[PDB]
Design a protein around this ligand. Structure first.
Ligand SMILES: CCC1=CC2(C[C@H]3CCCC[C@@H]3C2)c2c1ccc(C)c2[C@H](OC(C)(C)C)C(=O)O
Ligand SMILES: CCC1=CC2(C[C@H]3CCCC[C@@H]3C2)c2c1ccc(C)c2[C@H](OC(C)(C)C)C(=O)O
Lengths: 137, 137
């Protein structure tokens, strides 16, 4: 459970696409509703994630996602490698259903579920910080 | 320099709006190009930030930004208070100019500058994690 490994996958709900990144060692999640399942959307999300967390390698359950020239360039620029050493999408989907009524847009509902997921109990949010600070010291 | 304090401001470049959040104790930055300077854009950004970092209080140099019923609801939901105890927007603008040519869209350029800002040298990214893990332990 290395501190730099993330898993990226796209799931579907209400005819929309939700891109889910999981920090594998901690269970911490970053997720966003994207207009389309394209490389430009994937490339932009990776660039944003890498500027926020130390992202060393990325795994996926759909290898074809990392074929676009655009995603390769983002991984090139950010120094990210593909992971060769290797559920929550559904716990997230359960949390979204529980909070869907409180919000008009699904995107609002996804960020609320990401909040509840990462702050629920140590929390996934406390684990990622501990794991990364430990790796620093 | 409490670990839960963030400063949010909107800056302008190329006729677009960039929303910049600074973790005050560390100098770590989260920034995004938003289509418009509205409360719905501000409310969505706060909900996303709070699900990623422990956000206790938020300060701004434009108090009118926090007047919309929408932003108040996001702060209500996320348990965020307004800060009453209290530059980088320009170091970020310097980094964006240095990298603007490498990218077509300004939004791509902003995430690259956020990456360079947070990973430059201890780094702002290393400080925020240390500060928050220290506050946990
Ligand atoms: C008081 C008015 C109001 C509150 C919330 C703000 C949300 C903060 C988190 C809890 C739910 C709240 C619902 C909201 C409101 C008015 C319009 C919209 C379209 C939304 C939400 O959209 C955004 C977060 C703004 C992009 C949504 O999708 O409903
Ligand atoms: C090889 C093709 C290619 C690479 C980059 C991907 C970027 C990754 C980080 C360094 C610059 C790269 C430029 C790119 C490319 C093709 C089209 C666009 C429109 C973009 C960038 O847009 C997004 C990040 C995709 C939203 C941009 O705005 O140029």
């Amino acid at each position: 459970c290395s501190p730099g490994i993330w898993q990226l996958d796209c799931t579907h709900l209400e005819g929309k696409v939700i891109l889910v990144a999981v920090h594998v060692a901690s269970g911490y999640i970053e997720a966003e509703v994207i207009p389309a399942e394209t490389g430009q959307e994937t490339a932009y999300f990776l660039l944003k994630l890498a500027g926020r967390w130390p992202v060393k390698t990325v795994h996926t359950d759909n290898g074809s996602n990392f074929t676009s020239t655009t995603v390769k360039a983002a991984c090139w620029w950010a120094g990210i490698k593909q992971e060769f050493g290797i559920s929550m999408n559904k716990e997230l989907k359960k949390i979204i259903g529980q909070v869907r009524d409180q919000a008009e847009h699904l995107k609002t509902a996804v960020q609320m579920a990401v909040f509840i997921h990462n702050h629920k109990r140590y929390s996934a949010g406390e684990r990622i910080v501990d794991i990364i600070a430990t790796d620093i010291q």
